[PDB]
Design an enzyme around this catalytic site. Structure first.
Site, PDB file in Angstrom:
ATOM      1  N   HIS B  30       0.825  -1.241   0.000  1.00 17.35           N
ATOM      2  CA  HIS B  30       0.000   0.000   0.000  1.00 17.35           C
ATOM      3  C   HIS B  30       0.855   1.287   0.000  1.00 17.35           C
ATOM      4  CE1 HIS B  30      -0.168   0.405   4.634  1.00 17.35           C
ATOM      5  NE2 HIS B  30      -0.109   1.701   4.234  1.00 17.35           N
ATOM      6  N   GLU B  54       0.117  -7.737   1.191  1.00 12.53           N
ATOM      7  CA  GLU B  54       0.777  -6.458   1.589  1.00 12.53           C
ATOM      8  C   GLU B  54       2.296  -6.591   1.604  1.00 12.53           C
ATOM      9  OE1 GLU B  54      -0.860  -2.862   3.625  1.00 12.53           O
ATOM     10  OE2 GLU B  54      -0.252  -3.310   1.523  1.00 12.53           O
ATOM     11  N   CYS B 139       4.619   2.660   7.785  1.00 10.89           N
ATOM     12  CA  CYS B 139       4.392   1.437   6.966  1.00 10.89           C
ATOM     13  C   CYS B 139       5.609   1.185   6.031  1.00 10.89           C
ATOM     14  CB  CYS B 139       3.050   1.451   6.241  1.00 10.89           C
ATOM     15  SG  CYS B 139       1.646   1.292   7.392  1.00 10.89           S
TER      16      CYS B 139
END
Ligand SMILES: CNCc1cccc(Cl)c1
Lengths: 172, 172
Positions: B30, B54, B139
């Protein structure tokens, strides 16, 4: 908004913590024994309150006017999980969870240290991982969140080289 | 954590990624910019992309980081392993957050369905927010641990719960 980390300041042979613009706390044994000023203020104008391994400085002018005043308490309830806010000279920030226990006099390496006992919650070894304290970390603050409020309840005084046990020196 | 591990942590899209070797770069799916056709001055044409949910791995046909040695990438770690998440924060501050790892999990976190290795932070008891926990800009940060003489990378940061106490590592 200034983070908690901006309050953790290199001082003497370790560290201390800005509670408010005028109030700085540290471990008694890291304070220099030869000094005429701290943070540019003559010792003339600094009130020093010493209680065993806990020392509080009260300055007559605002040294850190960017900060709001925080709650300082005399230790915390037994069983509270605190964080010890450790800074390292590499630029690493190492928040470590500690389960707090009783107030006591404890035998740590050679010596009797009085304060609130705690147990690190980062497991068996540090192993050479960033998971435990070292001697240069003295004066790092103990903090926890209570409803909306950050609370500071003491300063890092001692630890066993055998991993597990730390002492948090407290006010009064 | 050793300087060579921090050197591999790279600002990328809306978060981070990690150089495993001179040719191999891992990140969280993402954070990759959706329109991007060039990475480190190379066309897509010249890159082998391996995507599993992911987790995304980029294998380049030339050496982008010849300063680096290849290291071990594993598919997650045993339960009970304590990892560090290598998080960079505003101003060359380095935050190696301690996490106890658990089972492979499927979760719903703020209307995203997330799959990876779950863990619990060891930084403090109410870790929500930037001083003791993760923020969305973290992230892609790597999960690493030391094994006897070696360090291992075992995933990248994918998500955290509303409370902040639970995190999810995406795994190969
Ligand atoms: C709520 N207190 C945290 C904690 C840590 C380690 C053991 C226990 Cl029983 C409790």
């Amino acid at each position: 908004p200034p983070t908690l980390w901006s309050r953790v300041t290199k001082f003497g042979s370790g560290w201390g913590f800005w509670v408010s613009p005028t109030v700085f706390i540290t471990t008694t044994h890291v304070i220099p024994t030869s000094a005429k000023e701290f943070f540019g203020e003559p010792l003339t104008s600094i009130a020093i309150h010493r209680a065993g391994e806990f020392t509080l400085f009260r300055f007559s002018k605002k040294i850190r006017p960017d900060l709001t005043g925080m709650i300082l308490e005399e230790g915390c309830p037994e069983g509270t999980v605190c964080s010890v806010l450790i800074k390292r000279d590499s630029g690493e920030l190492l928040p470590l969870a500690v389960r707090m226990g009783a107030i006591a006099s404890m035998r740590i390496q050679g010596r009797l240290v009085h304060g609130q006992s705690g147990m690190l919650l980062t497991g068996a070894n540090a192993k050479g991982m960033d998971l435990g304290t070292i001697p240069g970390d003295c004066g790092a603050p103990y903090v926890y969140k209570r409803a909306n409020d950050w609370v500071v309840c003491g300063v890092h005084a001692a630890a066993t080289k055998s991993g597990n046990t730390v002492v948090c020196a407290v006010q009064a």
